[PDB]
Amino acid sequence: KKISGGSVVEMQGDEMTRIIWELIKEKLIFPYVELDLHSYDLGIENRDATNDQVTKDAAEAIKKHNVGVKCATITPDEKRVEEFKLKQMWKSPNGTIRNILGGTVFREAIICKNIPRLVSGWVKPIIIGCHAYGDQYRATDFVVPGPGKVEITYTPSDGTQKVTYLVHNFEEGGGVAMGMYNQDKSIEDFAHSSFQMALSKGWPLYLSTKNTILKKYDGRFKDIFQEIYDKQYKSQFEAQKIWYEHRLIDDMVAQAMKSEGGFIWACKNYDGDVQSDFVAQGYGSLGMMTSVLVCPDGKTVEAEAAHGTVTRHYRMYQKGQETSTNPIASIFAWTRGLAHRAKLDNNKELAFFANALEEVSIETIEAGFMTKDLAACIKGLPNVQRSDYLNTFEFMDKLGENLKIKLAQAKLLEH
């Protein structure tokens, strides 16, 4: 340790990303940065041991210290309950953290010049602004055991009326039902975040919904975005030769896929979750994407790997087999978190370290040292040989050596 890093909230995760997370801290961060680290173990077992309280504590720590960096975590279903003998099917820690913090999760591919894409046309970045709040991640779903009536009701706080809507009358057998919601103020912040990102990047903005089907639910998003655009951003967009357009989600994915990129894509929570993997995979690999929750206040951020815990690679690791899991997304959670930390504290030295590690990461890959997923982008997966990539530790170790070099050269300047 040497650089004064400041207060950072660290959230440890599960399976293969937990392995990578420790290597990142051991080989890339702690040798060069001293941190007032507020660590919360969001491993599935410690969440289970604290009845998921540790997750809530972590989110509140992020509000207090303004910078969070999170490792990928298991969201358990019935299979996971059996695997770890869990007490309950705990809720997604990301859902919990995102709805406590609110805001927009901006996601963007991490691009290296030597990594071919699956979508050849994407010569410019696509940035998804994913609404962090509401919808499926806060839904209330249940099994309908048999015939009966499902209704959804609204009662104003003053209790002067009650509106009851019929969802469905199950006449023969049961099934499933769910309710979900969103809030105006959150949608408004989501809109402001989306318009400001497009102006910051100088690119057009597109919002996707399905308002032809969900005329009230999605129509609200469409209406709030439009009212804010016409009233506070159309002039600035027109001044920068950019524009805002609402599109039906299904037409948006097709247009995005045949475009050349270079636009901000405001997505509802569920769509941003799914399409950000469409985008990440289209540029090359799920391992090559940044994901930063930006709250409305502007001062608090949570950086994360958007991909999962890579269970399949972890199973190989458990058997002693060689893995080649891409750590770039996990590394950029740290760099994006520390960069925001540096901005808040006017820490020029930490700002340099953060950008230097991002540069090292891209320079290492562009020099031909990469994990198997990226080697498969260059060649074809059926043509990849072992000599074409580095295993998980080898790649981390190469990054470590290149980081030591770049930081050593930085000290050889006149100071």
Ligand X SMILES: O=C(O)CCC(=O)C(=O)O
Residues that bind Cl ion (CB under 5 A): 295, 297, 300
Q: Which residues contact 199 (CB under 8 A, 6 or more apart)?
A: 233, 236, 237, 240, 242
Name the minimum Å distance from CB 97 to a copy of itself: 14
> Kindly report the CA angle at 330 between 409 and 98, in degrees rounded to 5?
130
Q: Does 376 bind ligand NDP (CB under 6 A)?
A: no
Query: Residue written as tokens 């903005």?
Result: 205
Cβ proximity to ligand NDP, 10 vs 233, nearer residue: 10
The gap between the terminal CA atoms of the chain, to the nearest Å, is 20
Residue selected from 45, 83, 250, 401 as contacting ligand X according to rule CB under 6 A: 250
Query: By CB under 6 A, how many residues form the interface with ligand X?
Result: 10
Q: What angle do CA 391, 395, 401 make, to 5 degrees?
A: 145
259 sits near ligand X (criterion: CB under 6 A): no
Residue selected from 312, 315, 379, 386 as contacting ligand NDP according to rule CB under 6 A: 312
Q: Which is nearer to a copy of itself, 51 or 409 (CB)?
A: 51
Answer whether 331's CB lies under 8 Å from 24's CB: yes
- Which residue of the chain is nearest ligand X when measured via CB? 75
Hey, which residues does 313 pair with through a beta bridge?
Answer: none
* Shortest Å distance, C-beta 73 to a copy of itself: 11
| Rg of the chain taking only CA atoms, in angstroms | 23
Q: Which of residues 241-260 bind a copy of itself (CB under 8 A)?
A: 248-251, 253-254, 257-258
Q: Which x/- pattern over 135-174 shows residues binding a copy of itself (rule: CB under 8 A)?
A: -xxxxxxxxxxxxxxxxxxxxxxx----x-xxxx-xxxxx
Site size with ligand NDP, rule: CB under 6 A = 22
Binding flag, residue 36, ligand X (CB under 6 A):
no
Residues sharing a CB contact under 8 Å with residue 106, sequence separation 6 or more, in sequence order: 127, 128, 129, 130, 193, 197, 290, 291, 292, 294
Confirm or reject binding of residue 212 to ligand X (CB under 6 A).
Answer: yes
Does position 373 interact with ligand NDP (CB under 6 A)? The reply is yes
* Contacted entry of a copy of itself, ligand X, Cl ion, none for residue 414, CB cut-off 5 to 8 Å set by kind: none
Out of 286, 289, 351, 365, which residue is the one contacting ligand NDP (CB under 6 A)?
Answer: 286
22: Cβ–Cβ under 8 A, 6 or more apart, which residues?
Answer: none
User: Residue 76 or residue 400: which is nearer to ligand NDP going by CB?
Assistant: 76
Is residue 70 within 8 A of residue 97, CB to CB? The reply is yes
Q: Which of residues 223-262 bind Ca ion (CB under 5 A)?
A: 250
Alpha carbons 220 and 211: distance in angstroms, whole number: 8
**Residue whose token pair is 């890339």:** 28
Binding-site ranges for ligand NDP (CB under 6 A): 72-75, 94, 212, 248, 251, 286-287, 304, 306-312, 325-326, 329, 373
